Structure formats: structure tokens, C-alpha cells
Amino acid sequence: DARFLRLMKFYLMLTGIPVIIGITLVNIFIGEAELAEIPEGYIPEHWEYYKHPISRWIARNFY
């Protein structure tokens, strides 16, 4: 009942800490998108209607 907790916390931190650091670095240096209007006959792509970089990366690639 302590070995399980050590392994739990280890394997969860293993990809929590890199992922969280990724969230922070994206939000700092690659931050959210601003709003704008349609520049008179542009026809955006579908990911340009979303805000976050991670979200629109996912949408551009896998959707």
C-alpha cells in the first residue's frame, strides 16, 4: 500500500510533467488566437474557426 502509490505517482508524473510543461510553453510562447472577421472572400479552413493551438493542430491534421 506504498509500493502501489509510488508506482502510481511515478507512471502518472512521467507523462504529466512533460505534458504540463508543454501546455505552459504553448500558452506562453505560442499563445491563444485572437478574433477577427472574414476579409471579403477568404473562405477559411475549418481549423481557423478554433482558438487554441493544440486544438487547431489536432483539427488540421486528424480531422
Ligand X SMILES: CCCCCCCCCCCCCCCCCC(=O)OC[C@H](COP(=O)(O)OCCN)OC(=O)CCCCCCCCCCCCCCCCC
End-to-end CA distance of the chain: 43
Q: Of 13-21, 33-41, 42-50, which segment contacts ligand CDL by CB under 6 A?
A: 13-21
Residue 24: name its binding partner from ligand X, other proteins, ligand CDL, none (Cβ under 5 to 8 Å by kind). ligand CDL
Whole-number Å distance between alpha carbons of 22 and 52: 13
Whole-number Å distance between alpha carbons of 52 and 32: 5
Q: List contacts with other proteins (CB under 8 A).
A: 1, 3-4, 6-8, 11-12, 14-16, 19, 23, 28-38, 43-44, 48-56, 58-59, 62-63
